[PDB]
C-alpha cells in the first residue's frame, strides 16, 4: 500500500534564546522562580534539515522541534521504539480537517507521507493496525514551535505559533510555549519521525533537552516574560546567585552552576555463582520455632528474581533498607534464621512485639537491619492424620533476650511446692505440639518464616546484588558506585596506602576521601567537582555586559 | 619591604595554600565552601 | 568548629549523606535529609551571629 | 462512596495524599481509574515503593502518588468449575517498568546466550502465563479485583 | 482561574462557583490597637489608640 521514493550532511545553527516552556502546572504570579528541570540550553546546537530527507532521529528526554513554512508541508509525527509492529507506537496526524491521535500497533512503511495533488490522495503511512489502546479525534510567513516530553506515563506537548517575515533561518528572539496537550498513553519512546505532505518547500530544526537550572520571571497573567540560563557565562551565574536580572558595580563572589556530572560508573567484585535460594526455601523439613535454625550465606549473587515462579510471599518486610535498593548493595555478612509457626503468629516476628512467640521462642532486637519473609505451606507441612512434628515453648520463667535460644526441657513449677519431675498438679512440661490438619482455618495453618540479617561495614563484600559492572572513567565528573557506596566527583589516582582489608577512607569532615577499586585492587581518591573561589568583576549591567573573572 | 627595626621585631612574634598543593585542615575547609579573602 | 560540626547526625540515621542516599528511596530518605539540612543551617547561623 | 455499603466489602482501602475522612468535603479536578485482577497475595505490591513480580513487570506506582487503592475478593464471579484461564500476567522482562507504563508485547524472552528468533527451545521462553482460578483455592491465590 | 494569591502565598481572592462573581478575603484581626493605662492599682480606666 506504500512505495519507496544524493543526501547531504545537514547544516547546524543555534537556538539563541528559544525553547522555554512551563515546567509544572502550578500557578505563580509576579515572582522570580529558580527551577531545576529539563530545558533547552541557550545558544545550543540545533540541526537544520531542509528536498525531503526524512530520517529517524533519537528522542533523548524530550525534543524541541521548530518549523518555518508557507504551504503546510509538515503534517504530523510518529513516535515509538522499533516502529515495526512488534511494539506500540503513537501517531499524530492532521489531515486538513481534524487532529487524529492513535496509540496502536502499526506496521509503518519505510518512508511515510500523506498525499496532495486537488482534493486528497495517497494515505501511504502504514499497512495495518491491530490493538489500538488509545484513540483521540478533534473535528515564509509562519513559525511553529513544539516541545515534546513524556514522563510518568503522560505525553506532554507544548506549542507556540508566531508570524515571521525573515525567510531562510530560525530567527533570534525569545519564546515561551504554552501547554497544548497532556495525553495518558503510557508507552516507551526512543525514536520519532515526521510526515510530509507531497505535491504530485519548508524546513525544520531539531534540538534536544538537557537538565539545567533556570531563573524565570512570571508576569501578572502568569506568562513567562524572561528567563536566564545559569550555566552560560559568568554574568548569567552572578544573575542567578543574586536572583535578579540586573547588577550594579561590585565584586560578587559567585556559586557553582557551571558543571553537571555526566557519566555513571559501577564497580562490583567478580562473583558469579548464584545464591542457594531453593535449598533454604523448599528444604523438605524446616526447624521447630523453639530450636530455630541459623545458617551463614557467603559468596553469592543474591538474586531474588529466581523465586517469582515458585513461591508467593504473604509477608516481605525490610527494616534497615529499602526493598527497591537491594539490587545495588553489596553486603558483608548475611545470616538466615528459619522456622515454622502458625498463621496468626506471623505478626509477632517484628521488633518490639509481644505475645507467645516473641516472649518465649524467638525475639528480634530493636535496632535490627534485615528482612523478614513468610509464606503459607499447607501443601507441604499438613497431612491427613495431622503433622505432629513441630513443637513450641509455652511456659518460661522469664522473657528471652534478642537472638537467644532455649532448648531445655525441665519441669516448669507454677505453684509453690517443688516438682522434681513428676508432673502433677501445678507442674507442667513446657513444650507442646502443633497439630496441622489440611482442613484448618487460615488462622492456624502452617507458615514458614525466614529472617535475613545483614551488615555493611569497612570490609570486603561477600554477597552482592545482580548489577553489572562497567568501565572506569578518570579525571572527570562522574557518579560512581563502588561496592554499593554511591557518590559524585572526580576520580584520580593516589598513593594513600591502605590496610589489607580496608575498603575506603574518610577525612576529618566525615566524608569519603579515598576508595579501593574492587576488581583491580588499586587506590583512588575523590575530589569535589565544584571550584568555590571565583569572583566576577562587573560594571553596571545597565552600562555594559562585560565582566572579568578572578 | 622597607619596614623599620621595631616593626621587624613586631612581625616575628605574632604567628599568623595554592590549589596545586591541596590536590591538613585548610584543604578540609576549602572543599566544604569556606574561603578566606585577602 | 564549623568543619568539625559536620560529623553530627541531628537525629538522622547517619551523618554521611551518601549512606542515606544509597540505602533508602526518596520518600524514605527525605525525612533524614530534612533533618540534616535543618541541623546544618543552624551552625551557619550561629557562626554568622558570632 | 455510600452507595456501595450494601454491595461490596473492601478488604483494602488505602488513601495516600489525603485523609479518608476528608473525601466528602473536597472537589477534584481530574480523576482516573485503573482496574485489573490479580492474586490475593499480590495485593500488598500495589503501593508506592514496593517490589516483586507485579510491581516490576506489570503495574508500577510513582513515589509521589496522590490517590486511593481499593481491592476486594471476587471468588464468586471470577472462579469457575473447570478453572478460569482468562487472566494473564507477565513473568519475564528485560528491565523494570517505569511508573504508569504498559507493555503488551509478546516477543520471545532470551534468557541464555544464542538468539531465539521464535522457536521457544531450551533458554527461550514465552513471557505471558495464565492464572488458574479454581473455587477450592486457598485464600493466598484466589482472585482479587483492584481499582486505583 | 478559580482563586488568586498574593506575595505572601496566602489566598487573596476567590471566585464563587454558583454565581461566577469575584470576592476577596481580608483578615478578621485588627493589629494596631494600643491601650493607655495608669497603674491597675490606682484605677481601672483605659484609653484606646
Ligand atoms: C576480576 O575480573 C577481571 C576481569 O576478569 C576477566 O574476565 C572474566 C570474564 C574472566 O574470564 C576472568 O578470568 C578474567 O580475568 C580481572 O581483570 C583481568 O586481570 C587479568 C590478569 O589476571 C588481565 O589479564 C585482564 O586483562 C583483566 N581484564 C580486565 C577486563 O581488566 C580481575 O583480575 C579480576 N579481579 C580479581 C579478583 O583479581
Ligand atoms: C447553579 O444553581 C443556582 C440555583 O439553581 C436553581 O435551582 C436549581 C434547583 C435548579 O432549578 C436550577 O435550574 C436553578 O437555576 C443558579 O442560580 C440561579 O440563577 C438563575 C438565573 O439563571 C436565577 O433566576 C435564580 O434565582 C438563581 N437561584 C439562586 C438560588 O441563586 C445558578 O445559576 C447555577 N449556576 C450556574 C451553573 O450558572
Ligand atoms: C547564532 O546564530 C545566529 C543566527 O544564525 C547568528 O547570528 C548571525 O550573526 C552574524 C554575525 O553577528 C550575522 O552576520 C548574521 O546576520 C546573523 N544571522 C541572523 C539570521 O541573525 C549568531 O552569530 C550565532 N552565534 C552565536 C553563538 O550567537
Ligand atoms: C480525516 O480525519 C479522519 C481520519 O479517519 C476522517 O474523518 C472521520 O473518519 C471516519 C472514518 O472514515 C468517519 O466515520 C467520520 O465520519 C469522519 N469524520 C469526522 C468525524 O471527522 C477522514 O478521513 C478525514 N476527515 C474528513 C471528514 O475528511
Ligand atoms: C492485538 O491483537 C492481536 C491480533 O492478532 C493479538 O494477537 C492474538 O492473536 C490470536 C490469533 O493469532 C488471537 O487468538 C488472540 O485472541 C489475540 N490476542 C488477543 C488478546 O487479542 C494481540 O495479542 C493483541 N494484543 C493484546 C495483548 O491485546
Ligand atoms: C540467665 O540465667 C540466669 C541463671 O539461670 C537466670 O537468672 C535467674 O533468674 C531466676 C528467676 O528466673 C532468679 O531466681 C535467679 O536468682 C537468677 N539468677 C541470677 C544469677 O540472676 C536468668 O533469668 C537467665 N536470663 C534470661 C535471659 O532469662
Ligand atoms: C525503552 O526502550 C528502549 C529501547 O527498546 C530500551 O532500552 C534498551 O535496553 C536494552 C537492554 O534492555 C539495551 O541493550 C539497549 O541498548 C537499550 N537501548 C537504549 C536506546 O537505551 C529500554 O529498556 C526501555 N525502557 C524501559 C522502561 O524498560
Ligand atoms: C514455572 O514453573 C513451572 C512449574 O511450576 C508450576 O507451575 C507454575 C505456573 C506455578 O503454578 C508453580 O507454583 C507450579 O509449581 C514450569 O513448568 C514453568 O515452565 C516455569 N516457568 C518458566 C521457568 O518458564
Ligand atoms: C441490600 O441489597 C439487598 C440484595 O443484596 C444482597 O443482600 C445483602 C444484605 C448483601 O448480602 C448483598 O451482598 C446481597 O447481594 C437488597 O435486597 C436489600 O434490600 C438492600 N438493602 C437496601 C438497599 O435496603
Ligand atoms: C522499501 O525498502 C525496504 C527496505 O528494506 C524494503 O523492505 C521494501 O520492500 C521496499 N519497498 C518497495 C515497494 O520497494
Ligand atoms: C555544533 O556542531 C558542529 C558540528 O558538529 C560544530 O562544528 C559546532 O562547533 C557545534 N556548535 C557548538 C556551539 O558547539
Ligand atoms: C494580561 O492580559 C491582558 C489581555 O487579556 C492585558 O490587557 C494585560 O495587560 C495583561 N497583564 C499584564 C501584561 O500584566
Ligand atoms: C527444591 O529445590 C532444589 C534446588 O533447586 C530442586 O532441585 C528441587 O527439585 C526442589 N524440590 C521441589 C519439590 O521443588
Ligand atoms: C542606563 O543607561 C541609560 C542609557 O545610557 C541611562 O539613560 C540611564 O540613566 C542608565 N540607568 C542606570 C540605572 O544606570
Ligand atoms: C496601691 O494603692 C494603695 C491604696 O491607695 C496604696 O496603699 C499602695 O501603695 C498602692 N500600691 C502600688 C503598687 O501602687
Amino acid at each position: 500500500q506504500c512505495v519507496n521514493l544524493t543526501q547531504l550532511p545537514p547544516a547546524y545553527t543555534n537556538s539563541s534564546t528559544r525553547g522555554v516552556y512551563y515546567p509544572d502546572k502550578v500557578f505563580r504570579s509576579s515572582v522570580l522562580h529558580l527551577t531545576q528541570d529539563l530545558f533547552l540550553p541557550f545558544f545550543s546546537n540545533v540541526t537544520w534539515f531542509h528536498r525531503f530527507d526524512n530520517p529517524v532521529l533519537p528522542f533523548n528526554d524530550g525534543v524541541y522541534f521548530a518549523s518555518t513554512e508557507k504551504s503546510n508541508i509538515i503534517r504530523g509525527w510518529i513516535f515509538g521504539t522499533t516502529l515495526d509492529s512488534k511494539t506500540q507506537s503513537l501517531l499524530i496526524v492532521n489531515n486538513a480537517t481534524n487532529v487524529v491521535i492513535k496509540v496502536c500497533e502499526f506496521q509503518f512503511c519505510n518512508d511515510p507521507f500523506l498525499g496532495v495533488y486537488w482534493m486528497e490522495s495517497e494515505f501511504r503511512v502504514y499497512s495495518s493496525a491491530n490493538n489500538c489502546t488509545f484513540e483521540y479525534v478533534s473535528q515564509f510567513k509562519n513559525l511553529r514551535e513544539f516541545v515534546f516530553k513524556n514522563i510518568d506515563g503522560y505525553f506532554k506537548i507544548y506549542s507556540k505559533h508566531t508570524p515571521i517575515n525573515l525567510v531562510r533561518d530560525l530567527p533570534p528572539g525569545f519564546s515561551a510555549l504554552e501547554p497544548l496537550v497532556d495525553l495518558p498513553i503510557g508507552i516507551n519512546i526512543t525514536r520519532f519521525q515526521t510526515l510530509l505532505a507531497l505535491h504530485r518547500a519548508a524546513a525544520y530544526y531539531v534540538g534536544y533537552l538537557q537538565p539545567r537550572t533556570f531563573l524565570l520571571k512570571y508576569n501578572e497573567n502568569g506568562t513567562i516574560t524572561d528567563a536566564v540560563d545559569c550555566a552560560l557565562d559568568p554574568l548569567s551565574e552572578t544573575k542567578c546567585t543574586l536572583k535578579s536580572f540586573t547588577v550594579e558595580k561590585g565584586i560578587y563572589q559567585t556559586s557553582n552552576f557551571r558543571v553537571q556530572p555526566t557519566d555513571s560508573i559501577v564497580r562490583f567484585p567478580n562473583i558469579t555463582n548464584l545464591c542457594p535460594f531453593g535449598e533454604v526455601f523448599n528444604a523438605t523439613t524446616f526447624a521447630s520455632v523453639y530450636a530455630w535454625n541459623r545458617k551463614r550465606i557467603s559468596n553469592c549473587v543474591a538474586d531474588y528474581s529466581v523465586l517469582y515462579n515458585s513461591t508467593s510471599f504473604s509477608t516481605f518486610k525490610c527494616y534497615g533498607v529499602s526493598p527497591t535498593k537491594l539490587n545495588d548493595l553489596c553486603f558483608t555478612n548475611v545470616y538466615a534464621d528459619s522456622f515454622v509457626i502458625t498463621g496468626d503468629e506471623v505478626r509477632q516476628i517484628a521488633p518490639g512485639q509481644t505475645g507467645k512467640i516473641a516472649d518465649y521462642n524467638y525475639k528480634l532486637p530493636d535496632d535490627f537491619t534485615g528482612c523478614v519473609i513468610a509464606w503459607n505451606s499447607k501443601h507441604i507441612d499438613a497431612k491427613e492424620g495431622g503433622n505432629f512434628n513441630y513443637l513450641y515453648r509455652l511456659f518460661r520463667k522469664a522473657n528471652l533476650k534478642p537472638f537467644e535460644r532455649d532448648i531445655s526441657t525441665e519441669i516448669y513449677q507454677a505453684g509453690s511446692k517443688p516438682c522434681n519431675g513428676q508432673t502433677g498438679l501445678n507442674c507442667y512440661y513446657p513444650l507442646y505440639r502443633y497439630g496441622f490438619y489440611p482442613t484448618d482455618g487460615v488462622g492456624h495453618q502452617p507458615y514458614r518464616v525466614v529472617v535475613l540479617s545483614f551488615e555493611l561495614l569497612n570490609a570486603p563484600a561477600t554477597v552482592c546484588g545482580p548489577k553489572k559492572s562497567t568501565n572506569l572513567v578518570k579525571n572527570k565528573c562522574v557518579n560512581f558506585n563502588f561496592n554499593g557506596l554511591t557518590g559524585t566527583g572526580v576520580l584520580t589516582e593516589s598513593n594513600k596506602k591502605f590496610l589489607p582489608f580496608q575498603q575506603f577512607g574518610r577525612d576529618i569532615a566525615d566524608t569519603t576521601d579515598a576508595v579501593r577499586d574492587p576488581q583491580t585492587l588499586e587506590i583512588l581518591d575523590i575530589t569535589p567537582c565544584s571550584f568555590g573561589g571565583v569572583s566576577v568583576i562587573t560594571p553596571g549591567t545597565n552600562t555594559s555586559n562585560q565582566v572579568a573573572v578572578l | 619591604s622597607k619596614r623599620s627595626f621595631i616593626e621587624d621585631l613586631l612581625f616575628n612574634k605574632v604567628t599568623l595554600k595554592q590549589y596545586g598543593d591541596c590536590l591538613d585542615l585548610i584543604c578540609a575547609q576549602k572543599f566544604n565552601g569556606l574561603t578566606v579573602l585577602p | 568548629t564549623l568543619v568539625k560540626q559536620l560529623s553530627s547526625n541531628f537525629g538522622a540515621i547517619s551523618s554521611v549523606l551518601n549512606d542515606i542516599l544509597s540505602r533508602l528511596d526518596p520518600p524514605e530518605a527525605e525525612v533524614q535529609i530534612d533533618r540534616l539540612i535543618t541541623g546544618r543551617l543552624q551552625s551557619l547561623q550561629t557562626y554568622v551571629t558570632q
Side-chain angles (χ1 to χ4, degrees), chain A residues 156-222 224-351:
Chain A
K156 306 156 171 297
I157 306 182
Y158 310 85
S159 72
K160 197 186 183 185
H161 160 88
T162 60
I164 206 61
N165 188 267
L166 194 273
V167 296
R168 293 182 183 174
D169 181 65
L170 184 150
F174 173 86
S175 60
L177 323 181
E178 303 285 336
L180 178 51
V181 298
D182 189 319
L183 313 171
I185 66 174
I187 65 175
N188 185 15
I189 298 184
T190 322
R191 302 193 295 177
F192 80 106
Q193 185 178 358
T194 85
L195 319 168
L196 306 177
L198 298 191
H199 272 276
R200 74 175 69 260
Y204 49 107
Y205 316 89
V206 180
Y208 303 107
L209 270 46
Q210 288 162 29
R212 290 289 184 275
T213 310
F214 267 47
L215 179 80
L216 302 165
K217 179 183 176 183
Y218 283 93
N219 194 13
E220 177 200 27
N221 295 334
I224 292 184
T225 311
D226 263 336
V228 174
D229 179 16
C230 296
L232 186 59
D233 45 3
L235 184 49
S236 308
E237 176 176 288
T238 183
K239 288 178 177 182
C240 219
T241 306
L242 273 41
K243 295 193 60 175
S244 62
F245 283 71
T246 56
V247 283
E248 294 78 8
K249 295 172 55 183
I251 180 67
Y252 296 139
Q253 271 77 33
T254 65
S255 56
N256 169 273
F257 289 105
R258 51 188 168 274
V259 188
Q260 286 87 1
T262 307
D263 299 357
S264 69
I265 72 176
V266 180
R267 305 292 288 188
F268 277 8
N270 303 333
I271 312 170
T272 54
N273 64 34
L274 273 70
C275 228
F277 292 160
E279 283 75 359
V280 78
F281 265 87
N282 71 4
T284 287
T285 64
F286 256 45
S288 311
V289 56
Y290 87 101
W292 40 277
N293 198 265
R294 162 164 265 175
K295 170 185 177 62
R296 177 199 268 279
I297 293 174
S298 55
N299 258 38
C300 265
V301 175
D303 212 4
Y304 292 93
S305 164
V306 300
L307 290 162
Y308 284 173
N309 198 39
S310 300
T311 62
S312 51
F313 303 138
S314 308
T315 289
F316 192 113
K317 186 81 170 63
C318 294
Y319 282 101
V321 289
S322 280
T324 48
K325 307 214 67 61
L326 288 169
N327 286 8
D328 319 324
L329 284 164
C330 303
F331 310 96
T332 299
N333 196 93
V334 179
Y335 290 123
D337 319 341
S338 67
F339 49 92
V340 166
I341 55 181
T342 299
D344 278 356
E345 306 171 344
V346 196
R347 66 167 185 88
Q348 302 182 24
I349 314 293

Side-chain angles (χ1 to χ4, degrees), chain A residues 18 34 41 48 78 83 101 113 149 172 187 199 203 232 236 258 307-308 321 388 401 424 432 448 474 477 545 548:
Chain A
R18 301 197 158 277
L34 200 72
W48 170 22
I78 68 179
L83 313 160
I101 300 179
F113 63 95
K149 304 172 56 185
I187 65 175
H199 272 276
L232 186 59
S236 308
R258 51 188 168 274
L307 290 162
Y308 284 173
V321 289
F388 302 94
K401 289 184 178 298
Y432 289 89
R448 297 191 166 185
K474 309 192 65 187
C477 275
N545 285 11

